[PDB]
């Protein structure tokens, strides 16, 4: 449910996605991580659900890293209205995720349990994922 506590504008272009991710392409803080191999949007509900699916299962084992923030809002016109006549109100926050970006990373936890737990969380995201580990 990551709200950006403030933003310069509450509406801006949807934008486009092209090429690999700009940065954070490999694990940097954890032992192991999870990577996305296509481009898509990712929203508060997705990161929150994946985070809980991670931590609640992992319990006292260690800590989990999140490298994502839905700084981008996205709008939607009110239900049952003719299109046009002003951009709709904003009602959700989303994070752009180009392929190659590593989403979550785990620390201080055994390999196999992290593997299967990341596999568990991956089903929460809408995106084909690949397991990845630090060099």
């Amino acid at each position: 449910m990551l709200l950006p506590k403030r933003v310069k504008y509450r509406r801006e272009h949807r934008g486009k996605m092209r090429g690999r991710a700009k940065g954070g392409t490999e694990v940097h803080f954890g032992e192991f991580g999870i990577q996305a191999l296509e481009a898509s949007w990712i929203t508060n509900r997705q990161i929150e659900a994946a985070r809980i699916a991670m931590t609640r299962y992992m319990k006292r084992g260690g800590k989990v890293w999140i490298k994502i923030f839905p700084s981008k809002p996205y709008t939607a016109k009110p239900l049952e209205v003719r299109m046009g006549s002003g951009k709709g109100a904003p009602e959700g926050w989303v994070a752009v995720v180009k392929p190659g970006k590593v989403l979550f990373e785990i620390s201080g936890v055994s390999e196999e349990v992290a593997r299967e737990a990341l596999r568990l969380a991956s089903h929460k995201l809408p995106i084909k994922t690949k397991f990845v580990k630090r060099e």
Binding site: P78, E80, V81, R82, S85, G86
Partner: protein, 82 residues
């Protein structure tokens, strides 16, 4: 059925002005011609080229125009008599 929406209050703008250089590096020019219709001192005037009241650059002596770097970052126009 239908539902109502309004109050965009954004469909306005100024009838935009033209801003650019209308003499090419190496072009022959005549006295009083316009070189660069900037808005603000984007590029300072060199020799033989003036600076108008509205930050515009105009050639004082007919000749050839030339652009060249001023210092580290700034630019400057000049007119070299032929």
């Amino acid at each position: 059925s239908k539902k109502g929406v309004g109050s965009t209050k954004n469909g306005r703008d100024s009838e935009a002005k033209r801003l650019g250089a209308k003499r090419a590096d190496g072009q022959f020019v005549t006295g009083g011609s316009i070189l660069y219709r900037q808005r603000g001192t984007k590029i300072y005037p060199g020799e033989n080229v003036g600076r108008g009241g509205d930050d515009t650059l105009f050639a004082k002596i007919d000749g050839t125009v030339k652009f060249e770097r001023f210092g580290r970052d700034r630019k400057k126009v000049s007119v070299y008599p032929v």
